[PDB]
Amino acid sequence: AAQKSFRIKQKMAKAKKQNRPLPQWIRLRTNNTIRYNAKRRNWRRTKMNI
Amino acid sequence: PEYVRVQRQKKILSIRLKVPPTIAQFQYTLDRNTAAETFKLFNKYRPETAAEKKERLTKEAAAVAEGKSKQDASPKPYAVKYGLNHVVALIENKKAKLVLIANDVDPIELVVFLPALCKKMGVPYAIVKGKARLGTLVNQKTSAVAALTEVRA
Amino acid sequence: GAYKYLEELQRKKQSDVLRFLQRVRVWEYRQKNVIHRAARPTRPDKARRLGYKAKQGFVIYRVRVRRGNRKRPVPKGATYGKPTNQGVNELKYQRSLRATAEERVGRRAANLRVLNSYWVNQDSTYKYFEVILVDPQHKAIRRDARYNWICDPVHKHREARGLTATGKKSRGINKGHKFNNTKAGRRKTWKRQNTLSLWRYRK
Amino acid sequence: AGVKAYELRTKSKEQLASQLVDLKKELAELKVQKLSRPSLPKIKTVRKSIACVLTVINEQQREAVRQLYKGKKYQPKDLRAKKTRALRRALTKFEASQVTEKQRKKQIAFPQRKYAIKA
Amino acid sequence: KALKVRTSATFRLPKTLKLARAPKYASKAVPHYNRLDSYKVIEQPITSETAMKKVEDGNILVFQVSMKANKYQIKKAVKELYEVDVLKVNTLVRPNGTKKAYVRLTADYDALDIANRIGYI
Amino acid sequence: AISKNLPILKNHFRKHWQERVKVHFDQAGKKVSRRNARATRAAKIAPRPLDLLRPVVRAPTVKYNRKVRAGRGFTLAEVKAAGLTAAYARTIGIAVDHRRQNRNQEIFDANVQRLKEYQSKIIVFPRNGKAPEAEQVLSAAATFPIAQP
RNA sequence: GAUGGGGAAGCUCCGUUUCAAAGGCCUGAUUUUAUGCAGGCCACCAUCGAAAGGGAAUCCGGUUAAGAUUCCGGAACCUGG
RNA sequence: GUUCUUUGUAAAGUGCCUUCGAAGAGUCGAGUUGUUUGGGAAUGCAGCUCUAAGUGGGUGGUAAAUUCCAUCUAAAGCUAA
RNA sequence: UUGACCUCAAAUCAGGUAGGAGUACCCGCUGAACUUAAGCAUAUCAAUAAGCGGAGGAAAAGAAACCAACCGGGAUUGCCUUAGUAACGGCGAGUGAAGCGGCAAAAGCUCAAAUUUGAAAUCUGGUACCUUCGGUGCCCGAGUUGUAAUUUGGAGAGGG
Ligand SMILES: [Mg+2]
């Protein structure tokens, strides 16, 4: 909603900062098993449930 | 408040009910003139305070230092006896000469047997007003009993 | 010694002196709260025989509890089971009124430790107990080696674990052939004689 | 690089406060450069030096308060020992070693003897 | 003896002398320093093109501000850090969770002159 | 259910008996720790013989009264006849039982004789001084065996 | 929906002004002075519960890629001091 | 083990004679009700009612009366492995 | 009028303490039914699961108001055994201990009820100092409606 509470806006800000792909230099580290952001979230595909 | 109401209605109830004679063997207390003169007599025989006890012990220690008397430099005391088990043992041993019983001991069963015991053992007793009066006689707050067991000439 | 006079007078409860005194005191105790602090023990001989000493850090509370059975708390008496468990009314609580009295007193003063309790009065509705409590933080009980055992942390809520006198009475802790079910603990003995013991070389 | 705690410890509290405010001025001046430059690793040394100065100031003040409350009961709770709640509530060695005089008389009269058994 | 006259049937709790605390020891024994000082309320400027358009046109500085700071603290700390009198402060919370402050200066000072004194332009 | 000519079995396994199954896998390790405890106790009481002296005493029932065995402790009458107080006997390593009585003169004489031999065999150290070390034995029961009359 | 209380072995239940000693309000007086003592007044008696109920006060023009009764220019109003 | 304080005109133990020897109550116990136990004319626990004694009381696995005997000392408390 | 006592309060009074977590094991309360009986209601499952209260490194129990009936044993706990026994049970299904014996470990104890009565000899707190898990001095207070010393039934006390 437009009139939202600060708790909801804080959680929205955190999820907006989490919404990003993998940093590309992570794959160059030794013994790296991380291939991609497996915790990626999109607004069309799944809801936050907050 | 409720504490005022309870402390008034309790003494109301204690005379609304027919009390069995072991209670109201009390409440015929001593009259005020004879009570005043018996407390005037008892005030001459008062137990020693802490400070005069302390200087008594310093005098005794100095005396056993100089002359080595067997703690017998000080004379024989003459004091009122107090404490409930103490005076019950005195009455049972027939050593008490006069026993005063406070009329307001708040378990009354602490002192209901005392006049009958005094009558059986032949010790003269008096129910007197004021455990606070007995306490200020023996330098306490409350004493609930007092006894003269041996008096000066 | 006045205390044996107080005891042997206290055994004459239907003498007229004691029933008058009981009749006054039971009204006085209904007029107060359900749990309230007593200033001094009503029976000082009984208190000091159970272990009270008139020094700083010994506390007496007075408490009344409701008499009678324990009604089974089920909606409209429906138990939903076999007819052997359909009883609602005549069921009895396994602990004593003295036990639940001192347990409520301990919950009221959780910083204290329950030592003992004794009956003082009763009527049709209530039973009246006086509970002796000792403060395990007061220095007169931190010192005085006769009583500093109560400061050990294994004695927290003895009345809740059933370690007081009436607690051991209700748990059945006594020597003898009459107490074979409850001698070291009923559930402990049940586990001990329902355990299956298998050795390395099977006997 | 940064500052060193052992050479910070020789200064007074006003010099430490002034060094702290110049360190904060330097941190602001590096933060306004971080946005224009791609990388600026010099910020971390200033941050750790600020932490070091604050640690030295706090330890100086705490030691002064300890010496103010030295040798008396009822010192503050963050200055007295932490160990555990149960060990703080436990009896002291004196109270645990308190014994009645009757037991003390019995222990003096009949202590556990040392004995051996062959002859 | 005679009793005290009471013109009211209500009994109220009597007024008691209430003393103040005289503790034997201090509560925390080292008072904390300034939680939110001038260097903590002003983190860094915002130097996007939208913000930089404001600094000559509106005479408005744009700063990133800690989320615990209000307009009084922002105004006082801008006055203390840059020795500039301010006209007004308007704040918002950005969608990334930070706080942005538009500080409009007085007409005596020039925000374009102050920004490159700070070090960004 | 019931079947061919077999005895009637009574296997009490109708509760959740698999919740209470104690398999003594720790027999060997428990024995090892038990010997460790005995050795550290002996090192802690390094002159003393690790167990108290027990009296000889007659077993209770008619099935077992033909045999004699070890008791809990000596009678106060026995230790008074031996010529030492109960507190002193407890300190020098003699078990004292305040609640058994002497009704049998042979058992009384045997226990008094056993106390006499124990007092002849032990060495009691002075409480303060030299401690003349004396190479402990570990079993007063083995040095004073119980003999059937 | 706490408290005072009363039930309940107990998790907790009842009740919301009740079988409570339930508080704060202005003038000041004093100018070791702090705020007690001079006073006097009053008895509701926690608190939560509406972005559509009640309610102090802002409009126009312009401006951005994306904001505006919120920014800019002008012109007002209310509350507290 | 080495050293310093002397605790202490203190405390403790032991033999014989004599006078005594205080020992826990709405508890023990009994009836009844419910639950429980291997416990059976009633194993323990609890509710209600009744309610003791002091050469007494409890137990001695068949209820009761009478006469004995044996064995402990409840209704208060601490304690390692 | 003044000063006590008793009882009951109020303080952001001086100093403390309780709550919650964990919960394999421990101490209690409360408490089923599925199942078995070839149906089923007593019974069984089970004095169990779920629920609630309370601890510790163990807990609990523990130094006999015991076991026994013998030439008697001697706190508690645990193991082997007693024993699938005595006994309970629509005497059906099923249930079901304890004494003795061997062993592991072993350890004993203390309050109340007594007049110190030629001396409440006892104790918390505050303050000052010190060698500070505390000590000493001083001061209030607690306490005679009883805090210390003396005794715990195995005894023991008062005299000689
Ligand atoms: Mg009920």
Swiss-Prot record, chain A:
Output the superkingdom of the source species: Eukaryota
* Record-annotated membrane-spanning stretches: none
Q: Name one GO biological process term.
A: cytoplasmic translation
UniProt xrefs under Pfam families: Ribosomal_L39
Feature: compositional bias, Basic residues: 6-19
Keyword Acetylation included in the entry's annotation = no
The UniProt keywords, alphabetically, are: Cytoplasm, Ribonucleoprotein, Ribosomal protein
Picking any one GO molecular function of the record gives: structural constituent of ribosome
Major subcellular site: cytoplasm
| Quaternary structure, from the entry | Component of the large ribosomal subunit (LSU). Mature yeast ribosomes consist of a small (40S) and a large (60S) subunit. The 40S small subunit contains 1 molecule of ribosomal RNA (18S rRNA) and 33 different proteins (encoded by 57 genes). The large 60S subunit contains 3 rRNA molecules (25S, 5.8S and 5S rRNA) and 46 different proteins (encoded by 81 genes). eL39 interacts with YIH1.
What does the protein in this record do?
Component of the ribosome, a large ribonucleoprotein complex responsible for the synthesis of proteins in the cell. The small ribosomal subunit (SSU) binds messenger RNAs (mRNAs) and translates the encoded message by selecting cognate aminoacyl-transfer RNA (tRNA) molecules. The large subunit (LSU) contains the ribosomal catalytic site termed the peptidyl transferase center (PTC), which catalyzes the formation of peptide bonds, thereby polymerizing the amino acids delivered by tRNAs into a polypeptide chain.
Q: Which family does it belong to?
A: Belongs to the eukaryotic ribosomal protein eL39 family.
Question: What is this protein's name?
Answer: Large ribosomal subunit protein eL39
State the organism of origin.
Answer: Saccharomyces cerevisiae (strain ATCC 204508 / S288c)
Instruction: List the lineage, top down.
Output: Eukaryota, Fungi, Dikarya, Ascomycota, Saccharomycotina
Swiss-Prot record, chain B:
Q: Which domain of life is it from?
A: Eukaryota
| Main location as per UniProt | cytoplasm
Q: Name one GO molecular function term.
A: RNA binding
Q: Tell me the compartments it is located in.
A: Cytoplasm
Name one process (GO BP) from the record: maturation of LSU-rRNA
Alphabetic keyword roster = Cytoplasm, Ribonucleoprotein, Ribosomal protein
Q: A cellular component term (GO) from this record?
A: cytosol
Q: What does this protein do?
A: Component of the ribosome, a large ribonucleoprotein complex responsible for the synthesis of proteins in the cell. The small ribosomal subunit (SSU) binds messenger RNAs (mRNAs) and translates the encoded message by selecting cognate aminoacyl-transfer RNA (tRNA) molecules. The large subunit (LSU) contains the ribosomal catalytic site termed the peptidyl transferase center (PTC), which catalyzes the formation of peptide bonds, thereby polymerizing the amino acids delivered by tRNAs into a polypeptide chain.
Its quaternary structure? Component of the large ribosomal subunit (LSU). Mature yeast ribosomes consist of a small (40S) and a large (60S) subunit. The 40S small subunit contains 1 molecule of ribosomal RNA (18S rRNA) and 33 different proteins (encoded by 57 genes). The large 60S subunit contains 3 rRNA molecules (25S, 5.8S and 5S rRNA) and 46 different proteins (encoded by 81 genes).
Q: Which family does it belong to?
A: Belongs to the eukaryotic ribosomal protein eL8 family.
Q: What else is known?
A: Present with 238000 molecules/cell in log phase SD medium. There are 2 genes for eL8 in yeast.
Q: Per its record, how is this protein called by name?
A: Large ribosomal subunit protein eL8A
Whole-protein residues included = 53 to 205 of 256
UniProtKB/Swiss-Prot annotation, chain C:
Biased-composition ranges, Basic residues, are 168-184
Q: Output the PROSITE patterns linked to this UniProt entry.
A: RIBOSOMAL_L15E
- Domain of life, per lineage: Eukaryota
Compartment annotation: Cytoplasm
Q: InterPro entries annotated for this entry? A: Rbsml_eL15_core_dom_sf (IPR024794), Ribosomal_eL15 (IPR000439), Ribosomal_eL15_CS (IPR020925), Ribosomal_uL23/eL15/eS24_sf (IPR012678)
**What GO terms describe the biological role, i.e. biological process, of this protein?**
cytoplasmic translation
User: Keywords assigned by UniProt?
Assistant: Cytoplasm, Ribonucleoprotein, Ribosomal protein
Alphabetically, the GO molecular function entries are: RNA binding; structural constituent of ribosome
Region entry Disordered, spans: 163-184
Q: Which GO cellular component terms are attached?
A: cytosol; cytosolic large ribosomal subunit
Listed under subunit, the entry gives: Component of the large ribosomal subunit (LSU). Mature yeast ribosomes consist of a small (40S) and a large (60S) subunit. The 40S small subunit contains 1 molecule of ribosomal RNA (18S rRNA) and 33 different proteins (encoded by 57 genes). The large 60S subunit contains 3 rRNA molecules (25S, 5.8S and 5S rRNA) and 46 different proteins (encoded by 81 genes).
- Family, per entry: Belongs to the eukaryotic ribosomal protein eL15 family.
Supply any other comment: There are 2 genes for eL15 in yeast.
Report the protein name in the record. Large ribosomal subunit protein eL15A
Organism for this UniProt entry = Saccharomyces cerevisiae (strain ATCC 204508 / S288c)
From Swiss-Prot, chain D:
Q: Does the keyword Transferase apply?
A: no
**Is the Nucleotide-binding keyword given for this protein?**
no
What Pfam families does UniProt report for this protein, alphabetically? Answer: Ribosomal_L29
Chief site of localization: cytoplasm
In the record, biological process GO terms are: cytoplasmic translation; maturation of LSU-rRNA from tricistronic rRNA transcript (SSU-rRNA, 5.8S rRNA, LSU-rRNA)
**Membrane-spanning residues where?**
none
Q: Which UniProt keywords apply?
A: Cytoplasm, Phosphoprotein, Ribonucleoprotein, Ribosomal protein
InterPro entries recorded for this chain?
Ribosomal_uL29, Ribosomal_uL29_CS, Ribosomal_uL29_euk, Ribosomal_uL29_sf
Residues with Phosphoserine modification: 12, 49
> What superkingdom does the record give?
Eukaryota
Q: Anything else of interest in the record?
A: There are 2 genes for uL29 in yeast.
Q: Which family does it belong to?
A: Belongs to the universal ribosomal protein uL29 family.
Q: State its role.
A: Component of the ribosome, a large ribonucleoprotein complex responsible for the synthesis of proteins in the cell. The small ribosomal subunit (SSU) binds messenger RNAs (mRNAs) and translates the encoded message by selecting cognate aminoacyl-transfer RNA (tRNA) molecules. The large subunit (LSU) contains the ribosomal catalytic site termed the peptidyl transferase center (PTC), which catalyzes the formation of peptide bonds, thereby polymerizing the amino acids delivered by tRNAs into a polypeptide chain.
PANTHER family named in the record: 60S RIBOSOMAL PROTEIN L35, LARGE RIBOSOMAL SUBUNIT PROTEIN UL29-RELATED
Query: HAMAP family in the record, alphabetically?
Result: Ribosomal_uL29
Q: What is this protein called?
A: Large ribosomal subunit protein uL29A
